[PDB]
Symmetry: C2
Subunit: 101 residues, 2 copies
């Protein structure tokens, strides 16, 4: 395998490898980032549920530290988040994380 | 089908159903509850990535 796929422990497969790295390590690197930034505020850019799935570690990450986070969605097939840009303009947020194509 | 499974948009098939209630409508019914309850904060007990 190359990318991410879901592999529950309920499946007990043997003969498979993946070439994707560890998302929880990615989340830990983002933790190291934002705590080096000392931010108590962050903002998620996503479009899919799947990116949220793969980065749900960062969703549970404010257990160790008080930080308010905003997680709102791109246009799914159209490509104009300038309404969402004006949304975050009223959202007044500047500490923004990006994952998309 | 009965269970929810993921059906993406680029999943562009034609021959499928599921009797499953839609997550947004479920979530918004929960919103109706909480807006009937006027809550400032919340806490989810949940299973997994689903």
């Amino acid at each position: 395998q190359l990318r991410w796929k879901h592999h529950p422990l309920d499946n007990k497969d043997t003969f498979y490898v993946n070439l994707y790295p560890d998302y929880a390590s990615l989340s830990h690197a983002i933790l190291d980032l934002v705590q080096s930034l000392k931010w108590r505020s962050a903002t998620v850019v996503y479009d899919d549920s799947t990116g949220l799935i793969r980065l749900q570690e960062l969703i549970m990450a404010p257990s160790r530290y008080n930080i308010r986070l905003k997680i709102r969605q791109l246009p799914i097939d159209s490509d104009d988040s300038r309404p969402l840009l004006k949304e975050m303009k009223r959202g007044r947020e500047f500490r923004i994380i990006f994952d998309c194509s």
